[PDB]
């Protein structure tokens, strides 16, 4: 180190040269993903392949205002709907078994 | 040496057969050779 230069924070002391990867497949990978889902939807008669999530709260002090897609409706919400677990699997709604359905408002 | 082994004798006879020069007709449609004194079979 010399002059006004800040202390470095690089970790290239270990043999990184065989532990490094450069992405040149990105846009074609994106095309392949698009092609795969498009092919799948079309094969299913063009019927939706999309999954309908519950709305759930984002956690702690920072994100408590915000709400996002959750894992699955679970029994109390399904019972309130009048829908079976078997029906929930049969249809596009998202499925779970251990997400508690919490407060009344949610 | 003077007495011999059937496998060795056969391979040596092969090497001798391979050694002999190319057909001249082939050039009308020779990269490798051995000489016994200066090149041994290395066996």
């Amino acid at each position: 180190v010399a002059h006004n230069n800040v202390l470095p924070n690089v970790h290239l002391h270990k043999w990184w040269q065989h532990r490094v990867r450069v992405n040149f497949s990105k846009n074609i990978k994106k095309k392949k993903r698009r092609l795969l889902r498009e092919k799948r939807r079309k094969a299913n008669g063009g019927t939706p392949i999309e999954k309908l999530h519950p709305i759930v709260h984002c956690p702690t002090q920072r994100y408590n205002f915000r709400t996002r897609l959750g894992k699955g409706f679970t029994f109390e919400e399904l019972k309130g709907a009048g829908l079976t677990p078997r029906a929930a699997q049969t249809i596009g709604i998202c499925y779970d078994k251990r997400r508690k359905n919490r407060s009344e408002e949610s | 040496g003077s007495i011999k082994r059937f496998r060795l004798k056969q391979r040596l006879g092969k090497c001798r057969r391979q050694n002999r020069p190319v057909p001249h007709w082939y050039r009308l449609k020779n990269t490798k050779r051995r000489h016994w004194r200066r090149t041994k079979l290395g066996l």
């Binding site: 299913n44 008669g45 019927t47 939706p48 078997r86 699997q89 049969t90 249809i91 596009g92 | -």
Partner: protein, 119 residues
Amino acid sequence: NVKAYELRTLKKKELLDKLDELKKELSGLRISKALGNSAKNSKIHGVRKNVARVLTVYNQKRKMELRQLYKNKKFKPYNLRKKLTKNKRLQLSPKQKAAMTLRQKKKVQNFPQRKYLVV
């Protein structure tokens, strides 16, 4: 010279007699070639191919007869059985893979997935 279908016409005694005849002729050509004579040398290739045709036809007929002999009854001899990859041979059957417990059978039959629309 000789052509496969003509050989396939022949009975096994007749085909073998032709095979033996060709060997004797082939030997005569070979002896002639070994001698200082150059009269018939090129014909030896043709005869060797003719012998090859005889043997292929006889062997195909014999193989078919063996297959006819071991028609069904579950087991052909080892190397008359299916030669396929060792892995493919080892592999679990799709039929067995498909099969499932009674509770699984109930689950499948009762609850398959269905296709849908919206307004």
